[PDB]
């Protein structure tokens, strides 16, 4: 039906736009829609089943308002107008989260609806194919390398979740590239109240066998055994109460396809022993292969441009693990705002969201705590364990750890003390309380000094000038901190 | 089309640091094969090569990545 | 309203962006929901081969409606001649053209 | 020899309900057809979708299904799900447990056995006035 | 060049005596044995 | 490979040597990869202010 007119010959059009016309006509035709406006406002906007629920008007606005170099600072520059919008609107523009994606991310995942939501977010795609990396890279247009970052979608990578007497986690076949979901069930059979046990996969037939004591017995040794016969964990000496212990063991399908028990035997110096045990079973389940949590991780990561290596810390450090909600996104958006607003590291932005400096190391990188306090390992290490109550007043002394704190915040003792007061204006004493909370808050007063051209003495002069004098970071909400 | 998808080729990070006398594990008349192969970039380069050639057509570049302004 | 306030020099980058993003979205939809089964389109690359138009090109490339009508036909013909397409008509392929 | 074979078929010549009328084969299709011809040979590839619905016979039998289907979960044996193809004078039988890569989840509303491709020997296809 | 390669391999297959064949490789030893040897030949000639 | 030293020859011990690694000059990076991979030296002249 194309006319052979002059205007189809001498007018330059972009490619893509011609392709978009073709797809829109094919798409409009199917589903019988009145116009391209329906194709876009209804079909494409609200179609989660596919790579994306694309909202054109949203992107039209987002891109132009981002072409406007201020990055919405011009609206902030005018509070009468900025205040007409929820902060989320502004944040929802700086991050590429369309209203439909927002709703997807904000709905909490209810396990009783794992299938029910699967059918909402996916078309009639059996998980059998959806779960394979061949399909996933296609469904999501991801690099197959990125799929390796999207691993360990559990409450932790280390100490994982437990509820209603079980564990639900993905296990990766390291050479195949595939992942399957397993349910590990744990029922108590003996005196679990004296000593517990947990079993986590880490690869096929590879398990982390963890244990914990509630009541001390003077064992000469501990022997943890499969069906009370095959030793799995050997521990010498009397083990301790409220200490988590672990070892890497092998339990093959012969050991785990049928119900089995792990004995926990506390062998005394005498011929007797005290014991605890739980019954375990490990099975692969299609019933848990929904990975709705993955769908979100992928969509969120691309909307935020936060690779899982930074993003998991952002979401797990601020809320309950294994889910995403509005509260989580708040922290994500805020983290991005500061990252976008100041020439700072994404971790810095997270701290400014009233987040602690984490002691957990991961992904071949030092823990956030170590990055600040042990990179300068001044012939020993600082641990934030409540013991090293180093005297931090002006005219004060201590060991190299005091020097570590001085170095960590790049300030002298007079300023370091003032910084304690900045966090806590009641902490006028000669010490650091030595925990992550106050160290993180010391870091925050310093960060406010790094993001603005302020000295430490000036941080207080300004708070007074403003009316924020005597603000305790030790008692500041994240909303107040952002404020 | 003929090549099909680029295969996923994971790398191993496991090594036993065996002693040489033990390493000298031989044939006659936890891997069985103590050592591992490399990728074979010659074959992998066919995808890398096509990917660039296609990239250039899609981005209006010449065979060597130079810009061009054809009518 | 917001779009309306741009200089043409800016409107042009807006379009380049929107056009590339939109096509990816429409293309994906097509593949999953409205593509016919007989044409076994698995990805945007096949979509190109079927609809005879490249939806992965940058917005920098310019054309005309006729230039795309030619080209899209030429591709069709080339695949027919090279037997990429399964059953081109014997009495048509032999035509002098 | 130019062969005009449609690339997709979705129509029916006949159909029916199960023995107890508590189900029927759903009006499904043959979404893809491909072929290769040669002097004195022909191969036709049928890539069918066999859909099963627990739709009973109209009347009290459909109503029994409505309850059977809504108040429980599916049964159907994939080994006996099959497609019988007859080309002219030759017959071939294919089953869902061999020619389907993914079996559908059990349900009563719909199960769809999507076959990969049935390779049909068309050399037994008998033409009358070039119609077969 | 295309035609000559087909004497060794045709991804689309071959027709023999009018019959549609079930193979792509037209060299018997390439058609047969579709697995990699687990034990490589210990040699210096890539041809061996 | 980027250092100064006296020689260790038998008649070069009193010679002063300076060295530079080509790899550390990052010459290749001055032009896009797409221009070609074979990048070889044609000539070297030395200026000693």
Residue E30: in which H helix or E strand, if any? helix E28-31
Question: Which alpha helices (DSSP H) does A305-433 contain, by range?
Answer: 308-316, 326-341, 346-351, 368-373, 400-408, 413-423
CA torsion A137-A139-A142-A145 (nearest 10°) is -20
Yes or no: say if E13 and E23 are a contact pair by the CB < 8 Å rule. yes
User: Angle A292-304/A326-341 helices, nearest 10 degrees?
Assistant: 20
- For residue B8, the chain A residues in CB contact (below 8 A) are 133, 144, 177
Q: Are A222 and A235 in contact (CB under 8 A)?
A: yes
Q: How far are the Cα atoms of A84, A221, A233, A264, F10 from residue A210, in angstroms, in the given order? A: 53, 16, 9, 11, 67
Q: How many Å apart are CA A357 and CA B34, to the nearest integer?
A: 43
Q: Mutate which of B3, B47, B60 to test chain C, going by most C C-beta atoms within 10 A?
A: B60
Give the up-direction half-sphere exposure of residue A224: CA atoms within 13 A in the CB hemisphere.
28
Integer Cα distance of A459 and A466 in angstroms:
11
Tokens 């109240």 belong to A193
Longest dimension (CA), chain A: 103
What is the C-alpha separation between A167 and A183, in angstroms, rounded?
6
Report D:88-117 residues touching A (Cβ under 8 A). 102, 104-105
User: How far F39 CA lies from chain B's nearest CA (Å)?
Assistant: 16
Q: Does E15 touch chain D (CB under 8 A)?
A: yes
- Three-class SS state of F41: coil
The answer to whether B47 touches B3, Cβ cutoff 8 Å, is yes
Q: Which of E15, E19, E20 to mutate to test the interface with D (most CBs of D within 10 A)?
A: E20
Q: Which residue has the tokens 């501990």?
A: A222
From the CA atom positions of chain E, what is the Rg in Å? 14
Tell me how crowded residue A443 is: count the other CB atoms within 10 A of its CB. Answer: 25
**B62-65 own/partner pairs: CB under 8 Å, 24+ apart:** B64/F34, B64/F35, B64/F36, B65/F32, B65/F34, B65/F35
Neighbouring-strand partners of residue A276? A264
User: Which residue bears the tokens 């059990």?
Assistant: D106
Alpha-helix runs per DSSP H in D14-107:
60-70, 96-99
- Alpha carbon distance D76, C63 (integer Å): 56
Which candidate, D50, B55, D98, places its Cα nearest to that of C58?
B55
- Concatenating the DSSP letter of every residue in A76-124 gives HTSHHHHTTS-HHHHHHHHTT--HHHHHHHHSPPPGGGHHHHHHHHS-S
- Give the strand pairing for D49-53 and E15-16: unpaired
Place of tokens 């030949």: E41
Q: How many CB atoms are located within 10 Å of the residue A232 CB?
A: 19
How many CB atoms sit inside 10 A of residue F41's CB? 7
Residue A281 — φ and ψ, nearest 5°?
Answer: -140, 140
Burial label, A323 (beta-carbon count in 10 A; 0-12, 13-18, 19+)? middle
Count CB atoms within 10 A of the CB of residue C83. 11
Query: For strand D41-46 and strand D33-38, is the pairing parallel, antiparallel, or unpaired?
Result: antiparallel
Q: Which stretches does DSSP call E strand in A204-306? A: 206-213, 221-226, 230-236, 244-250, 260-267, 273-284
C61/C67 Cα distance (integer angstroms): 12
Count CB pairs under 8 A between chains B and C: 12
CB A162 within 8 A of CB A198: yes
Q: How far apart are CA C93 and CA C80, in angstroms?
A: 8
Strand partners, A278: A188, A262
Whole-number Å distance between alpha carbons of A384 and A365 = 19
- For C71, the enclosing helix (H) or strand (E) is helix C65-81
Q: Within a 10 A sphere around the Cβ of A112, how many other Cβ atoms?
A: 7
**F neighbour chains, 3+ CB pairs within 8 Å:** B
CB-based contact A385:A433 (threshold 8 Å): no
CB C53 within 8 A of CB C76: no
Cross-strand partners of A356: none
**Non-local CB neighbours of A123 within 8 Å, separated by 6+ positions:** A49, A50, C32, C33
Query: B54-67: buried (b, 16+ CB within 10 Å) or exposed (e) per residue?
Result: eebeeebbeeeeee
Taken as a whole, chain A contains a residue count of 483
Query: Based on the number of CB atoms within 10 Å of its own CB, is A274 exposed (0-12), middle (13-18) or buried (19 or more)?
Result: middle
Beta-strand relationship, A260-267 and A221-226? antiparallel
Interchain CB contact of E37 with D (< 8 Å): no
Q: DSSP state, C4?
A: G
- Chain C nearest CA to D115, separation (Å): 13
Q: What are the CA-CA distances from residue A86 to residues A32, A90, A92, F4 (Å)? A: 37, 7, 10, 65
Evaluated on CA atoms A90, A95, A100, A105, the torsion sign reads negative
CB of A294 closer than 8 Å to CB of A131: no
Partner residue opposite C38 with nearest CB, options D2, D3, D31: D31
Distance, in Å, from the CA atom of A405 to the CA atom of A412, rounded to the nearest integer, reads: 10
- Among partner residues D102, D104, D105, which is closest to A129 by beta-carbon distance? D102
Q: Give how far the C-alpha of residue B60 lies from the chain's centroid of Cα atoms, to the nearest Å.
A: 27
The helix/strand/coil state of A399 is coil
DSSP codes of every residue in D96-118: HHHH-SSPPPP-SS-EEEE---E
Contact A44, A56 (CB under 8 A): yes
Tokens at residue E25, please? 């490789």
Q: How far apart are CA A414 and CA A395, in angstroms?
A: 8
What DSSP state is assigned to residue A323?
Answer: -
Q: Under a CB-based contact definition with an 8 Å cutoff, are residues D107 and D68 in contact?
A: no
- Are chains C and A in contact at 3+ CB pairs closer than 8 Å? yes
Look up tokens 């036993």; give the residue.
B16
Rounded Cα gap, residues A315 and D113, in angstroms: 41
- DSSP assignment letter at A365: B
The region that residue A165 occupies, defined by phi over 0 for left and psi between -120 and 50 for alpha, beta otherwise, is left
**A304 exposure class (CB count in 10 Å sphere: 0-12, 13-18, 19+):** buried
User: Which among D83, D82, D87 is positioned nearest to D121, based on CA atoms?
Assistant: D87
Question: What resolution in angstroms, rounded to 1 decimal?
Answer: 3.4
* Distance (Å, whole) CA A346 – CA A311: 9
**Sheet strand arrangement including A230-236:** A166-172, A179-188, A273-284, A260-267, A221-226, A230-236
Which residue reads 């033990």 in tokens? Answer: B22
CA–CA gap between residue A311 and residue A305 (Å, rounded): 9
Please tell me the distance from the alpha carbon of residue A29 to that of residue A409, in angstroms, as a whole number: 64
Q: What share of chain B is helix, strand, coil (3-state, %, to 5)?
A: 30, 5, 65
Alpha-carbon dihedral sign for residues E7, E8, E13, E17: positive
Is residue A430 a contact partner of residue A396, using CB atoms and an 8 Å limit?
Answer: yes
Q: Minimal CA–CA distance to D62: which of D19, D21, D111?
A: D21
CB burial of residue B18 (10 Å; 0-12, 13-18, 19+): exposed
> Hey, how many other C-beta atoms are within 10 angstroms of the C-beta on A9?
11
- Helices and strands, counts by H and E, chain F: 0, 2
What is the Cα–Cα distance from B65 to B51, expressed in whole angstroms?
12
A262 conformational bin, left if phi > 0, alpha if psi -120 to 50, beta if neither: beta
Token pair of B16 as six digits: 């036993």
User: Nearest to residue A261, comparing CAs of A204, A222, A209?
Assistant: A209
Which of A389, A380, A394, A327 minimizes the C-alpha distance to A355? A327
β-pair partners for A226: A230, A262
D118-121 and D41-46 as β-strands: parallel, antiparallel, unpaired? Answer: antiparallel
Give the Cα separation of C29 and A53 in Å (integer).
Answer: 9
CA distance A14 to C17: 12
Q: Is A395 exposed, middle or buried (0-12, 13-18, 19+ CB in 10 A)?
A: exposed
Which of C10, C49, C65, C70 to mutate to probe the A interface, most A CBs <10 Å? C65
Nearest to D26 by CA among D50, D10, D59: D50
B64 at F interface, C-beta within 8 A: yes
d(CA E21, CA D118): 16
Query: And the tokens for A397?
Result: 């002394």
Provide the phi-psi class of A380: left if phi over 0, else alpha when psi is between -120 and 50, else beta.
left
User: Chain C closest CA to A5's CA: distance in Å?
Assistant: 9
Whether F34 and chain B come into contact, CB under 8 Å, resolves to yes
Measured CA to CA, the distance from residue D17 to residue A458 in angstroms comes to 86
Q: Which residue has the tokens 């194709």?
A: A39
Q: How distant is the Cα of B36 from the closest Cα of chain C, in angstroms?
A: 34
Which stretch of DSSP H or E encloses residue C11?
helix C8-29
Residue at token pair 């040669």:
D38
User: What is d(CA A227, CA D115) in angstroms, rounded to the nearest whole number?
Assistant: 45
- The whole-angstrom distance between residue A463's C-alpha and the CA centroid of its chain comes to 33
Q: Is B10's CB within 8 Å of A174's CB?
A: yes
Closest to A288 (Cα-Cα) out of A172, A180, A216: A180
Residue F18 phi/psi, 5° resolution? -130, 145
Q: By C-alpha distance, which of B69, B43, B65 is closest to B56? A: B65
């Amino acid at each position: 039906s194309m006319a052979l007119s002059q205007q189809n010959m001498d007018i330059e059009l972009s490619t893509l736009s011609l392709s978009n016309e073709l797809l829109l006509e094919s798409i409009k035709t199917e589903s019988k829609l009145e116009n391209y406006t329906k194709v876009m406002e209804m079909l494409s906007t609200f179609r989660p089943s596919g790579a994306t629920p694309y909202h054109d008007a949203y992107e039209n606005v987002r891109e132009v308002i981002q072409l406007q170099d201020p990055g919405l600072e011009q609206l902030n520059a005018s509070p009468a107008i900025a205040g007409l919008m929820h902060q989320a609107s502004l944040l929802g523009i700086n991050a590429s989260i369309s209203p439909e994606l927002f709703n997807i991310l904000t709905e909490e995942i209810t396990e009783g609806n794992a299938e029910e939501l699967y059918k909402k977010n996916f078309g009639n795609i059996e998980p059998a194919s959806l779960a394979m990396p061949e399909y996933l890279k296609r469904y999501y247009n991801l690099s197959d390398e990125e799929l390796s970052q999207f691993i360990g979608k559990a409450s932790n990578f280390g100490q994982q979740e437990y509820s209603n007497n079980q564990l639900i986690t993905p296990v990766v076949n390291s050479s195949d590239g595939t992942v399957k979901v397993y349910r590990i069930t744990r029922e108590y059979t003996t005196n679990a109240y004296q000593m517990d046990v947990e079993l986590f996969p880490f690869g096929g037939e590879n398990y982390r066998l963890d244990y914990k004591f509630k009541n001390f017995y003077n064992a000469s040794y501990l022997s943890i055994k499969l069906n009370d016969k095959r030793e799995l964990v050997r521990t010498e000496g009397a083990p301790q109460v409220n200490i988590e212990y672990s070892a890497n063991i092998t339990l093959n399908t012969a050991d785990i396809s049928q119900p089995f028990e792990i004995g926990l035997t506390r062998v005394l110096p005498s011929g007797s022993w005290a014991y605890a045990a739980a019954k375990f079973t490990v099975e692969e389940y299609n019933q848990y292969s929904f990975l709705l949590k993955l769908n979100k991780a992928i969509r969120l990561s691309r909307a935020t441009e936060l690779s899982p290596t930074i993003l998991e810390g952002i979401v797990r450090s601020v809320n309950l693990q294994l889910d995403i909600n509005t509260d989580v996104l708040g922290k994500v958006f805020l983290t991005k705002y500061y990252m976008q607003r100041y020439a700072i590291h994404a971790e810095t932005a997270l701290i400014l969201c009233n987040a602690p400096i984490s002691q957990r190391s991961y992904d071949n990188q030092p823990s956030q705590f170590d990055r600040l306090f042990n990179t300068p390992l001044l012939n020993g290490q600082y641990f934030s364990t409540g013991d090293e109550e180093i005297d931090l007043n002006s005219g004060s002394t201590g060991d190299w750890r005091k020097t570590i704190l001085k170095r960590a915040f790049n300030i002298d003792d007079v300023s370091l003390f003032r910084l304690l007061k900045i966090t806590d204006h009641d902490n006028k004493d000669g010490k650091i309380k030595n925990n992550l909370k106050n160290l993180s808050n010391l870091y925050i007063g310093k960060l406010l000094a790094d993001i603005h051209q302020l000295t430490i003495d000036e941080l207080d002069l300004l708070l007074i000038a403003v009316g924020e004098g005597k603000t305790n970071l030790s008692a500041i909400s994240d909303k107040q901190l952002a404020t | 089309h003929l090549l099909g998808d680029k295969p996923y080729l994971p790398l191993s990070t496991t090594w036993s640091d065996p002693r040489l006398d033990r390493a000298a594990d031989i044939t006659t008349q936890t891997l069985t094969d103590l050592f591992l192969p490399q990728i074979n970039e010659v074959m992998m380069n066919y995808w890398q090569t096509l990917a660039q050639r296609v990239y250039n057509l899609r981005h209006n570049l010449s065979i060597d990545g130079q810009p061009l302004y054809l009518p | 309203v917001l779009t309306a306030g741009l200089n043409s020099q800016q409107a042009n980058t807006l379009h380049a962006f929107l056009d590339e993003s939109r096509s990816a979205a429409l293309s994906t939809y097509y593949i999953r929901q409205v593509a016919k089964a007989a044409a076994a389109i698995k990805s945007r690359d096949d979509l190109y081969q079927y609809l005879l138009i490249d939806n992965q090109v940058s917005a920098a490339i310019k054309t005309t409606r006729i230039a795309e009508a030619i080209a899209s036909i030429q591709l069709y013909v080339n695949r027919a001649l090279e037997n990429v397409e399964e059953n081109a008509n014997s009495g048509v392929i032999s035509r002098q053209f | 020899e130019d062969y005009e074979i449609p690339s997709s078929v979705s129509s029916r010549k006949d159909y029916g309900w199960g023995d107890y009328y508590l189900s029927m084969v759903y009006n499904g299709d043959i979404p893809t057809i491909n072929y290769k011809a040669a002097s004195s040979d022909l191969k036709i590839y049928i890539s069918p979708k066999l859909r099963i619905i627990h739709n009973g016979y109209e009347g009290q039998k459909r109503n029994q299904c409505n309850l059977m289907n809504k108040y429980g979960k599916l049964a159907i044996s994939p080994a006996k799900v099959q497609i019988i193809v007859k080309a002219g004078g030759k017959e071939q039988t294919f089953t869902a447990d061999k020619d389907v890569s993914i079996q559908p989840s059990p349900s009563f509303d719909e199960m769809n056995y999507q076959f990969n491709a049935l390779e049909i020997d068309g050399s037994g296809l008998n033409f009358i006035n070039n119609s077969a | 060049a295309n035609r000559w390669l087909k004497y060794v391999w045709s991804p689309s297959g071959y027709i023999v005596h009018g019959q549609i064949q079930n193979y792509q490789w037209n060299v018997r030893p390439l058609l047969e044995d579709t697995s990699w040897n687990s034990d490589p030949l210990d040699s210096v000639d890539p041809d061996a | 490979n980027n250092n100064l030293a006296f020689g260790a020859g038998t008649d070069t011990k009193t010679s002063l040597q300076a060295s530079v690694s080509f790899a550390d000059l990052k010459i290749r990076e001055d032009y896009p990869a797409s221009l070609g991979k074979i990048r070889r030296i044609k000539q070297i002249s030395v200026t000693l202010p």
